[PDB]
Ligand binder design. Structure first.
Ligand SMILES: CS[C@@H]1CCCC[C@H]1OC(=O)N1CCC[C@H](C(N)=O)C1
Ligand SMILES: [Zn+2]
Length: 140
């Protein structure tokens, strides 16, 4: 589990969104596994606006932050799960790192700010949903 709190927005994995997130919905995209809801309090995270392909992510199943090299956002095939059928997920970046269930929502960050959140795992790989192109998270 986990979320990004920027401005008056809460960014979560669409597959882990709560009823309150759906009742206060700003934007959602199943092809990216992302959902954004509105918040009453202001958040403290800042979004990275950069081209970093190295950073650090939080792994809840290890209580640890790991440094990783990750691929550029791309269209990647993700196996059928209990949340989605087999499909291509867009704006997904892969790295070598542990990831198991408990773990979407952990933040990936660089020196510029938050890059994205854990969205896929298994096989000694970890995948992250990029948020750096969502410029509107910085306004309103
Ligand atoms: C993420 S850990 C898990 C490890 C065992 C193998 C499967 C791994 O699950 C995933 O990759 N998922 C499940 C939740 C939805 C994700 C998505 N964004 O489509 C895909
Ligand atoms: Zn950066």
């Amino acid at each position: 589990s986990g979320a990004i709190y920027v401005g008056n927005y809460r960014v979560v994995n669409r597959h882990l969104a709560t009823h309150n997130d759906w009742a206060n919905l700003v934007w959602e995209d199943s092809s990216r596994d992302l959902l954004v809801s509105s918040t009453t309090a202001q958040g403290c995270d800042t979004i990275a606006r950069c081209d970093c392909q190295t950073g650090v992510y939080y792994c809840s199943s290890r209580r640890k932050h790991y440094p990783v090299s990750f691929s550029k956002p791309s269209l990647i095939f993700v196996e059928a799960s209990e949340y989605y059928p087999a499909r291509y997920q867009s704006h997904l970046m892969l790295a070598v790192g542990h990831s198991e269930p408990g773990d979407c929502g952990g933040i990936l960050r660089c020196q510029h700010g938050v890059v994205g959140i854990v969205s896929t795992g298994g096989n000694g790989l970890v995948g992250f949903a990029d948020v750096r192109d969502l410029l509107w998270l910085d306004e309103e």
